[PDB]
Design a protein around this ligand. Structure first.
Ligand SMILES: CS(=O)(=O)Nc1ccc(Cl)cc1
Ligand SMILES: CS(=O)(=O)Nc1ccc(Cl)cc1
Length: 209
């Protein structure tokens, strides 16, 4: 049972602009997704400060980066607070309508595209490198869901019958054919060291056979 939804017009506009503008500094997508993961981890940590049972679904707070060259995917996994179904539908828990407006306004006033994260819509920089993004998520208050979009104005949501995650979010980047450098271990390490060196959670870069 798969539900298909239209993006709000402003979010569709933001994604087409990310996909179609010439912009060489594509590596910032990983900084943005790691920062989102850190934000989600902060949230569950804060909730656990007054209710330790919030961590019954997983005590470890971490970020994993999993490249897969056979599948041409880069997966970012965190054990943060996760997202409910309503969150997923409401632009993955972002205020994306007003954030997009402020981002394009900032761009008029001399802001850079790499400052997308300052407007709360850094998730959508995934489409700098990915032709399709799958988001698997489990929040303590809801079931496990999969969101998916290849842009083009729509996204889908379904219950996820895959591998149970306990709690958190998995962003699966189905990379564009010319963006496979982001599966290479030395390239990922370079980006994490450059842009994410002070993230307050362990970031583990998985290796492949
Ligand atoms: C400069 S623009 O027309 O806003 N395009 C754009 C905006 C955001 C990203 Cl991440 C990439 C390109
Ligand atoms: C930049 S850091 O947090 O000091 N260490 C690190 C560097 C690279 C990767 Cl892929 C993972 C962790």
């Amino acid at each position: 049972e798969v539900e298909t939804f239209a993006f709000q017009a402003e979010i569709a506009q933001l994604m087409s602009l990310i996909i179609n503008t010439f912009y060489s500094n594509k590596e910032i997508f990983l900084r943005e997704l790691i920062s989102n993961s850190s934000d989600a981890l902060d949230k569950i940590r804060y909730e656990s400060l007054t209710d330790p049972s919030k961590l019954d679904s997983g005590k470890e707070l971490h970020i994993n980066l999993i490249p897969n060259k056979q599948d041409r995917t880069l997966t970012i996994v965190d054990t943060g607070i996760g997202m409910t179904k309503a969150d997923l539908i409401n632009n993955l828990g972002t205020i994306a309508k007003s954030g997009t407006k402020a981002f394009m306004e900032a761009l008029q006033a001399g802001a850079d595209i790499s400052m997308i994260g300052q407007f709360g819509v850094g998730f959508y920089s995934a489409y700098l490198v990915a032709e399709k993004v799958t988001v698997i998520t489990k929040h303590n208050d809801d079931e496990q869901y999969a969101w998916e979009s290849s842009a083009g104005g729509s996204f889908t949501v379904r219950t996820d019958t895959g591998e149970p995650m306990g709690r958190g979010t998995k962003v699966i980047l189905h990379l564009k054919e010319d963006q496979t450098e982001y599966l290479e271990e030395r390239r990922i390490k370079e980006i994490v060291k450059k842009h994410s060196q002070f993230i307050g959670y362990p970031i583990t870069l998985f290796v492949e056979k």
